[PDB]
């Protein structure tokens, strides 16, 4: 029969366009479509809206886009996971489905003017309001200010309507108070369990006149290193010029949260011309862990506290680097990025992720499947190398073990890890597959990208594969979906997918073809693939000393700031005395600490593929369905399961 399909996101937000793709496979004629979305049980229709006409001048593909309105009766049953139906009427035919619903208007972000405030000072704070496309939007926001012990001493509920989603506020901190870590919590009136925060230290202080920066040669300690942890103090007057002074450093081992001092480590070096070397030796370390069985420090971090004092006596300041990973390898391999399901007989490409001991990426670092010398591959800028292997047509769980293959590092210094991948369960042992491959490069917007569409199946029915339909996930909603064609004789085709701002920070690919065979069985083989994109602002923003390049100004002087950004935007400025950071340099604002949310807040959960065809779609955050009965299973749980 002409199959009618209906893909939409696994979870649909509130006050949000969520698109939904309508397809009428193998069809004849203009076929109208009403689209309907009742609330769940007790059916009042929150969006009858949207209709269209699936003509044969796209090959019967179209869609419709709606907003689920956060109504009064979506504010009645609080704390249990809400629900909708989606009645996809295809004329005489109807194809409905049940979809989960997160409230989650959008994201919120909170700028402090600093990171630590003295009693009697006013905290200046700015709240940015954005729907999950990270656009600005107008809503209503409950804003709490909570004290040390977790108790709120001020509330508000403001409307960011007509403000470029930039809600400035102030809070005069009283002259007497509980010291400690304060909080500013906020939530959209419609999502009071999705609470965005931001902390800021209240503490008595004057500001220093210089900074310290402790840092080892290596971002880790190795245990069979006879030298010991080599460390460098560096100290500089906030105003650029170096220090002559005298420094007290000391070490200790952190272990969960328990921190152990190493009293006998406490050296007193003088500081010449800013810098000051120092070493926590091995023997002095190991003797302070009377656990004594060398290896036991594996995973136990180290920490250095310094305390630099000037030769006048006028000022001092402490500083500590917490978390030096005591390790048996300066690498670490993760299959966070690599799927967990292969395709029997076809390749299985391994997005190997690889890191230095502080969970950062390591660049140009060779990796290898164990059992496969010669074959190897280098990790690129982000920390991803791609390996790839031919699997045998049997359904045996895979057992891959990837090593680092650096020259310079003895084998026992190389890091390794290992995993298990499973076969995509074909529809009634038919051995029909689809495999999406993408070359391995730091993707920037403006470039264009090749997606290989590989088809593996028995040839008796492969001629009836006129297209792979595909869809794109970014930020939680469907970005785009189209058709990449294929005519017979082939096995691979290649989609030159144009890559724009709209894909940042990452995007998925879900694709599928439809075939009838064996006798009268409707088949749907699908595949996914998650692609990382270069994290960057969508727009752009700089501040520079526009006033004649260089020169160097004096107390009082008037200069000028080129601000260079997006036409029809609003910019909000702050300047801060670097001093403040010497105290607290935490919970400032970072584009990337945003993209963290955006991709903490995904709906997609698997790096690719699934246990079968259903898995493919619902892992990747979609809701395939049809008039034949082939569909994803219900999404019970709102969070990705881990």
């Amino acid at each position: 029969s002409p199959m009618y399909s209906i893909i939409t996101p696994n979870i649909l937000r509130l006050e949000s366009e969520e698109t939904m793709v309508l397809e009428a496979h193998d069809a004849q004629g203009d076929v109208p479509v009403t689209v309907t979305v009742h609330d769940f049980p007790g059916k009042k229709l929150v969006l009858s809206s949207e209709k269209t006409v699936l003509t044969p001048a796209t090959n019967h593909m179209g869609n419709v886009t709606f907003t689920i309105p956060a109504n009064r009766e979506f504010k009645s049953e609080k704390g249990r996971n809400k629900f909708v139906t989606v009645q996809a009427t295809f004329g005489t035919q109807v194809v409905e489905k049940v979809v989960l619903v997160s409230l989650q208007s959008g994201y919120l972000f909170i700028q402090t003017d600093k990171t630590i405030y003295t009693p009697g000072s006013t905290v200046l704070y700015r709240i940015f309001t954005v729907n999950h496309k990270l656009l600005p939007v107008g809503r209503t926001v409950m804003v709490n200010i909570e004290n040390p012990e977790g108790i709120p001493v001020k509330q508000d509920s403001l409307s960011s309507q007509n403000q470029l989603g930039v809600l400035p506020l102030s809070w005069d901190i009283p002259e007497l108070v509980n010291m400690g870590q304060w909080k500013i919590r906020a939530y959209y009136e419609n999502s009071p369990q999705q609470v965005f925060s931001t902390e800021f230290e209240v503490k008595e202080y004057v500001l220093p006149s210089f900074e310290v920066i402790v840092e080892p040669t290596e971002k880790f300690y190795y245990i069979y290193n006879e030298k010991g942890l080599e460390v460098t103090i560096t100290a500089r007057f906030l105003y650029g010029k170096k220090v002559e002074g005298t420094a007290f450093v000391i070490f200790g081992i952190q272990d969960g949260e328990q921190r152990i001092s190493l009293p006998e480590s406490l050296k007193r070096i003088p500081i010449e011309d800013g810098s000051g070397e120092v070493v926590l030796s091995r023997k002095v370390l190991l003797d302070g862990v009377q656990n004594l069985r060398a290896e036991d420090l594996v995973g136990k971090s180290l920490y250095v506290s310094a305390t630099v004092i000037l030769h006048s006596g006028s000022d001092m300041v402490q500083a500590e680097r917490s978390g030096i990973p005591i390790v048996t390898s300066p690498y670490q391999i993760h299959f966070t990025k690599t799927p967990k399901y292969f395709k029997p007989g076809m390749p299985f490409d391994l997005m190997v992720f690889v890191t230095n001991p502080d969970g950062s990426p390591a660049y140009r670092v060779p990796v290898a499947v164990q059992g496969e010398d010669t074959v190897q591959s280098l990790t690129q800028g982000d920390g991803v190398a791609k390996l790839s292997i031919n699997t045998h047509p049997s359904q045996k769980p895979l057992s891959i073990t990837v090593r680092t293959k650096k020259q310079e590092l003895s084998e026992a210094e190389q890091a390794t890890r290992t995993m298990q991948a499973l076969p995509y369960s074909t529809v009634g042992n038919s051995n029909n597959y689809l495999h999406l491959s993408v070359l391995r490069t730091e993707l920037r917007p403006g470039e264009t990208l090749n997606v290989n569409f590989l088809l593996r199946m028995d040839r008796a029915h492969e001629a009836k594969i006129r297209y792979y339909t595909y869809l794109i996930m970014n930020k939680g909603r469907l970005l785009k979906a189209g058709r990449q064609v294929r005519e017979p004789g082939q096995d691979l085709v290649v989609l030159p997918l144009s890559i724009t701002t709209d894909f940042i920070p990452s995007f998925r690919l879900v694709a599928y073809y439809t075939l009838i065979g064996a006798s009268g069985q409707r088949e749907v083989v699908a595949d996914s693939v998650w692609v990382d994109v270069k994290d960057s602002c969508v727009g752009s923003l700089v501040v520079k000393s526009g006033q004649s390049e260089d020169r160097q100004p004096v107390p009082g002087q008037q200069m000028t700031l080129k601000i260079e950004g997006d036409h029809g935007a609003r910019v909000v400025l702050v300047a801060v005395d670097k001093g403040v950071f010497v105290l607290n340099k935490k919970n400032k604002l970072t584009q990337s600490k945003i993209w963290d949310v955006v991709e903490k807040a995904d709906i997609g959960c698997t790096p690719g593929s699934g246990k079968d065809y259903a898995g493919v779609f619902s892992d990747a955050g979609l809701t395939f369905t049809s008039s034949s009965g082939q569909q994803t299973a219900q999404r019970a749980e709102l969070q990705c399961p881990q």
Binding site: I213, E215, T217, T232, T234, R236, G240, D273, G274, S275, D358, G359, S360, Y363, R364, G381, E442, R444, G446, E447, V542, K544, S545, G546, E549, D550, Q552, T590, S592
Partner: protein, 119 residues
């Protein structure tokens, strides 16, 4: 075809002396350069420390001001000259170059380089 940056992985240079963190390419016919960033990577996030646009050089962290003269007279060269070297200059530096093609659109190549300081 397109441009690629000849930037070496690890460059060593002595204490309180100079060094050339190379970053180069080979100019193509129409590929007009419009932005050269040097991004030092201290933490787990990167930051801009040099910048070049329609109006010359522009240093953006004071702890460099007057130490960092990027190399300008040669086409296909963006090497980071760097004098009176400090210990706190140990880091991974990026070289990021932006080109405009004729067809009123744009492309960007960046490569990364560790600066290590010997004694």
């Amino acid at each position: 075809g397109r441009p690629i940056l000849e930037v070496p992985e690890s460059v060593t240079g002595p204490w309180k002396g100079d060094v050339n963190l190379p970053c180069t390419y080979d100019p193509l016919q129409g590929y007009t350069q419009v932005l050269v960033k040097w991004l030092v990577q201290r933490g787990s996030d990167p930051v801009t420390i040099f910048l070049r646009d329609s109006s010359g050089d522009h240093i953006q962290q004071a702890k460099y001001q007057g130490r960092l003269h990027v190399s300008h007279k040669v086409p296909g060269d963006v090497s980071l000259q760097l004098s009176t070297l400090e210990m706190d200059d140990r880091s991974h530096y990026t070289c990021e170059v932006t080109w405009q093609t004729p067809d009123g659109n744009q492309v960007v190549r960046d490569k990364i380089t560790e600066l290590r300081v010997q004694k």
